[PDB]
């Protein structure tokens, strides 16, 4: 794999979104994955609905959290639609895929990356823009606002954060606190420290779309 990937230069990323104060992060990670890999799969860069994972994901919470497995393993099941046909709302409301007509997109499953382990993690993204989990309560990565971030930060991760690139020294995360925040929405995030768990736990649980 390349020394260096990153998934906006080839087109495959929409742009950043800010999830508000509803924790649907799960949604917005398991959302850049799927946007990623149907461009990589078809060509077409399309912007997918957050909102369809956060009312229709019910192995998850909506606004109160969820997992970025379920919602993956959601669109492989049933599909998404478009976010210009179920935009975002930042609320938990009543599912309403059926009534939106058919899909827009669908995949085949989802892989889990082995966890702990930073190759991996690494051979995924070569391959498409992964969901990860990461510690984001730290007033570190909170006021974040440029530069490889090494922490502080511990490993009990709770933010959902797409992995959608790499380099020499760093994991580049795409999050969803809108454009004005890191840099431009985005975080490089250091790698290669020897930490199995990542800084701030960010080989914990990594998943990613699957599409033939
Ligand atoms: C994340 C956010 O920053 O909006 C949101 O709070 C969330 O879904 N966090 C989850 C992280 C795991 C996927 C690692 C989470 O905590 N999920 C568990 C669901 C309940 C909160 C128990």
């Given at each position: 794999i390349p020394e260096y990937v990153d998934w906006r230069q080839k087109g495959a990323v929409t742009p950043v979104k800010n999830?508000?104060?509803?924790?649907?992060?799960?949604?917005?990670?398991?959302?850049?994955?799927?946007?990623?890999?149907?461009?990589?799969?078809?060509?077409?860069?399309?912007?997918?609905?957050?909102?369809?994972?956060?009312?229709?994901?019910?192995?998850?919470?909506?606004?109160?959290?969820?997992?970025?497995?379920?919602?993956?393993?959601?669109?492989?099941?049933?599909?998404?639609?478009?976010?210009?046909?179920?935009?975002?709302?930042?609320?938990?409301?009543?599912?309403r895929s059926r009534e939106k007509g058919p899909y827009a997109a669908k995949?085949?499953?989802?892989?889990?990356?082995?966890?702990?382990?930073?190759?991996?993690?690494?051979?995924?993204?070569?391959?498409?823009?992964?969901?990860?989990?990461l510690e984001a309560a730290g007033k570190d990565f909170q006021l974040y606002r440029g530069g490889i971030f090494v922490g502080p930060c511990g490993n009990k991760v709770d933010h959902a954060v797409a992995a959608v690139g790499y380099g020499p020294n760093y994991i580049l995360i795409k999050n969803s606190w809108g454009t004005g925040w890191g840099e431009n929405g985005?975080?490089?995030?250091?790698?290669?420290?020897?930490?199995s768990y990542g800084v701030c736990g960010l080989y914990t649980s990594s998943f990613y779309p699957v599409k033939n």
């Open positions: 999830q508000g104060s509803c924790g649907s992060c799960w949604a917005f990670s398991a959302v850049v994955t799927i946007e990623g890999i149907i461009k990589i799969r078809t060509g077409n860069l399309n912007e997918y609905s957050e909102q369809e994972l956060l009312d229709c994901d019910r192995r998850s919470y909506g606004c109160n959290g969820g997992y970025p497995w379920s919602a993956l393993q959601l669109v492989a099941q049933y599909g998404i639609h478009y976010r210009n046909t179920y935009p975002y709302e930042g609320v938990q409301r009543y599912c995949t085949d499953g989802v892989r889990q990356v082995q966890p702990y382990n930073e190759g991996a993690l690494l051979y995924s993204i070569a391959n498409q823009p992964v969901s990860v989990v985005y975080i490089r995030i250091k790698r290669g420290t020897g930490n």
